[PDB]
C-alpha cells in the first residue's frame, strides 16, 4: 500500500505556543493512493475458505 | 484540469486564522480532502 505523493508541511503559530501543521503543497503531480494484491494467490486463498464453509 | 479518479479531490482553501496576537488575523492557503469538508450552499 502506498500514498505516492511528495508533499510539503507548513506551520503557523495560531496562539501563544499553539502552532499547528497543515498539508501545504504537493511536489510532482497528483497521484492516487492504492493497494496491490496477488490475485491468483488470493483466489487460491479464497478457494480454501469455501471448502471450510 | 484532471481526468483521473483524483479529479475534484484535493481542495485548495482559504482562511482568516487568529494569530498569536489577540487583534491580528491571517489569510492562510491550505489543502484539504473531499472527506473532510462539507458544502454550506468559491462556495
Amino acid at each position, epitope marked *: 500500500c502506498t500514498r*505516492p505523493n511528495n508533499n510539503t508541511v507548513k506551520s503557523i503559530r495560531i496562539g501563544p505556543g499553539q502552532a499547528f501543521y497543515y498539508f501545504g503543497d504537493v511536489l510532482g*503531480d497528483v*497521484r*492516487m493512493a*492504492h493497494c496491490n494484491i496477488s490475485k491468483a494467490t488470493w483466489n487460491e486463498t479464497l478457494g480454501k475458505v469455501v471448502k471450510q464453509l | *484540469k484532471l*481526468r*483521473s*479518479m*483524483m479529479r475534484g479531490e484535493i481542495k485548495n482553501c482559504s482562511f482568516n486564522m487568529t494569530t498569536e496576537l489577540r487583534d491580528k488575523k491571517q489569510k492562510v492557503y491550505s489543502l484539504f480532502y473531499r472527506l473532510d469538508v462539507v458544502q454550506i450552499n468559491n462556495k
Partner: antibody, heavy 128, light 106 residues
Framework: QVQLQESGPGLVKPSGTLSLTCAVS?????????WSWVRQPPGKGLEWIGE???????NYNPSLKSRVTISVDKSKNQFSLKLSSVTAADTAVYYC???????????????????????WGQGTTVTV | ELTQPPSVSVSPGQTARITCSGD??????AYWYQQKPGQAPVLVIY???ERPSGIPERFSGSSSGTTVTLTISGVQAEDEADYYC???????????FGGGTKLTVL
C-alpha cells in the same frame, strides 16, 4: 514512421452510407493511443468526429451520434470510419488521426495526459 | 461549442494574442494547432502552457477561467497560418474544435 494512409470510396451518390478505412502504415496499434477522425469542409475549419481506443471504447460527436459508427481492424492494422445515409451536406476533406497520449501513472484508473494529436492522415476529398 | 475569433491581423515585430472561450475550459485543457496551407496541422501547445520539442519559444500560452490565450511573442511574417484550439466535453467524453483563426502579418 507510423504513416497514415486513407482509404474509402470516391464520388458518392447522395444519401448513402460511407464506410472508410485508414490503412495504418507502420501499423502497431497495440493499446498505446487513441485513434480518431476529423474532417474539414473545403472552405471551412475543422470538425471533430469521433474517437476510438484499441479495446473498443468509442467516443462520438453528440451532433453526429446517430449517423456515425466506428470500429478498428487490428488484424490488418486498419480502421473503420462508417456512416449512415449522409447527404451532400458533408462533402468534406477527411483526415485519419492519432490522439497520442502520455501515461502519467496507473493506466487502469485513467491517469494519463492527452498529448497533442500527433500524426495526421492524408486528405480524403469525398464528393457526394 | 467553442468560440474563437475568426481573423486577427497584425504587423511584423508584434505580439499576437488569440483566445478561445468555453464553459469546459475551467475544467479541461486546451490544445493548439497550426494549419499551414496545404499541410497537416502541427501541434503547437499542449496542456495549456507546454510546447513540444522542435517548437520555438515565441509561442506561449495561458488560461483565464473560461478564456484561454494563445500567445506568439515576436511575430514573424512566416507564421501566417491557421490556428485551432481543441478541448473536450465538460464530462470529458468527446472532443470539440475551435472555429478558426486567420493571421495576416504586414
Amino acid at each position: 514512421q507510423v504513416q497514415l494512409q486513407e482509404s474509402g470510396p470516391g464520388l458518392v451518390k447522395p444519401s448513402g452510407t460511407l464506410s472508410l478505412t485508414c490503412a495504418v502504415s507502420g501499423g502497431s496499434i497495440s493499446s498505446s493511443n487513441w485513434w480518431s477522425w476529423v474532417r474539414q469542409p473545403p472552405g471551412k475549419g475543422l470538425e471533430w468526429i469521433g474517437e476510438i481506443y484499441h479495446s473498443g471504447s468509442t467516443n462520438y460527436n453528440p451532433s453526429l451520434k446517430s449517423r456515425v459508427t466506428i470500429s478498428v481492424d487490428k488484424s490488418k492494422n486498419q480502421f473503420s470510419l462508417k456512416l449512415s445515409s449522409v447527404t451532400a451536406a458533408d462533402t468534406a476533406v477527411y483526415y485519419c488521426a492519432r490522439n497520442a497520449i502520455t501515461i502519467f501513472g496507473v493506466v487502469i484508473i485513467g491517469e494519463y495526459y492527452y498529448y497533442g494529436m500527433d500524426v495526421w492522415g492524408q486528405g480524403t476529398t469525398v464528393t457526394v | 461549442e467553442l468560440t474563437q475569433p475568426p481573423s486577427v491581423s497584425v504587423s511584423p515585430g508584434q505580439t499576437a494574442r488569440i483566445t478561445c472561450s468555453g464553459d469546459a475550459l475551467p475544467k479541461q485543457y486546451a490544445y493548439w494547432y497550426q494549419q499551414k496551407p496545404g499541410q497537416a496541422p502541427v501541434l503547437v501547445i499542449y496542456k495549456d502552457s507546454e510546447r513540444p520539442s522542435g517548437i520555438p519559444e515565441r509561442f506561449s500560452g495561458s488560461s483565464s477561467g473560461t478564456t484561454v490565450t494563445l500567445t506568439i511573442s515576436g511575430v514573424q511574417a512566416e507564421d501566417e497560418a491557421d490556428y485551432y484550439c481543441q478541448s473536450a466535453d465538460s464530462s470529458g467524453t468527446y472532443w470539440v474544435f475551435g472555429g478558426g483563426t486567420k493571421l495576416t502579418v504586414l
